[PDB]
Symmetry: C2
Subunit: 286 residues, 2 copies
């Protein structure tokens, strides 16, 4: 029985994952921003599930955009439980529109939400996990960072691509500390540009209709019975695998956009390089 | 003879590329920050080359971290020449150290320099290129976004990974406007963490010596005669290729870290997806 923290768990993969892990008997902290306001109903929904099923599912206020918020929440868990066994980076947020119409700040904000968030959380949690010389980081990545993708989500896909690159780096840099990494790669199963005038130029020029054309074409390739719970069940299986035998990436992509193939080539090239330079021990947590 | 703007051209690939393009007879704006202070010598070096060789190489103040700076510089070129035929995104900056020891702001700053920079420049330049219905964006990407890589450069590799994802998106989103894209993928041929205490923990724990071990192991695989001018010559060749027949990516990687293989798989999967959804026209500028 593990102590687990998941970020951005108000709904989506985050929430089903927190519930499935708690179903598997773990002590699960399902964290999220603004539990008194914006997420009050989600808190109620999750709390009701936890009591109805008699599982150790707890909700925790954790705003990943605030270091002070993050620090407080990590201190609560450590003061209560002594450690974190599994850290699940899931907080995220996407957008749609012509990249040119998104402002520089918009891209920055996206980075904040999808990447800087993980760094705040890691900088808070990692000191404790490093003292244990043991632990598992799970990152919810995205098939888009190495598979076929639609146009019109650039600030989002950029941030996710950076997030996966960072996950990979930590995997190596934490391995001598005994910390394991597993990256979940979900396929296809939300803001817009602030520059309305620029977007209107796109709509009246050669890209007229492209936005809707993209949404429809990409919706159409998702199997109608594709279920987001597949991701939660992949995660319960990772957590339930013996230490040292966890997969590095798990692909859950009913639309089969190819990230399984892309990443398995990238993963192979990256390992090849570490063998080549005499650093193959970084491929395997101590 | 083309009108060309290159960012971050004070030295490095940027500078040799500006000189080679000017050698090929183009009108080249080699832009950079702070030409009166920090880059005054670089300005002198470049200006001396231009007069000695009698080439149309011009230096231009352009601070990619300032929208006002960017706008001014683009207005100067357009007021002088009427258009930009080739836009070369090259401004960049790297760092080395354990990812945990870099602060959230540090990662943000890196993103600013390596990604938000291109967005400021694109938002300024693209309206003009779109009116022409013609033009070429060249991005200087990095073998690290799809090849074997060292640990200890996470904020940098993250930013470059996002930058490549963005380049790919613009390639599709600009194609109906007639704008071509080519991405240069240079292999191996500089700040540090602000959190000294955290870095000192890494140095005294299980990652003792890893920093130097990485620098030495990765230096050793670069062929001693690998020359950075290979990149400049690849770019002159792209620019000199007929419109509509430019390669999408050009790999220049003497250490052979595998990004050629990684990207050619990713490129294939991405095209496959656009054919699959009926958007294959996005693969080919109008």
């Amino acid at each position: 029985k593990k102590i687990i923290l998941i970020t951005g768990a108000s709904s989506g993969f985050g929430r089903l994952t927190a519930e499935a892990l708690a179903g598997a008997g773990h002590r699960v902290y399902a964290s999220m921003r603004d539990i008194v306001g914006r997420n009050a109903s989600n808190v109620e929904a999750i709390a009701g599930f936890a009591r109805d099923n008699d599982v150790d599912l707890r909700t925790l206020e954790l705003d990943v955009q605030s270091q002070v918020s993050v620090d407080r929440a990590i201190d609560q868990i450590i003061g209560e439980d002594g450690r974190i066994d599994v850290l699940i980076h899931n907080a995220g947020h996407m957008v749609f529109g012509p990249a040119e119409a998104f402002t520089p700040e918009q891209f920055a904000e996206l980075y904040d939400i999808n990447v800087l968030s993980t760094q705040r959380v890691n900088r808070a949690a990692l000191p404790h996990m490093r003292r244990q010389k043991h632990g598992l980081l799970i990152w919810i990545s995205s098939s888009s960072s190495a598979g076929g993708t639609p146009p019109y989500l650039a600030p989002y896909f950029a941030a996710k691509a950076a997030m996966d690159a960072i996950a990979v780096q930590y995997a190596r840099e934490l391995s001598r500390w005994g910390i394991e990494t597993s990256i979940i790669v979900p396929g296809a199963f939300s803001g817009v540009p602030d520059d309305h005038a620029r977007q209107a130029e796109y709509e009246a020029g050669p890209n007229a209709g492209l936005g809707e054309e993209i949404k429809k074409a990409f919706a159409a390739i998702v199997p109608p019975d594709a279920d987001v719970s597949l991701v939660a069940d992949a995660i319960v299986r990772v957590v339930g695998t013996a230490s040292g035998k966890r997969p590095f990436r798990v692909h859950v992509d009913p639309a089969e956009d190819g990230a399984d193939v892309g990443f398995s080539v990238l993963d192979r090239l990256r390992a090849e390089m570490l063998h080549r330079v005499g650093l193959s021990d970084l491929l395997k947590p101590r």
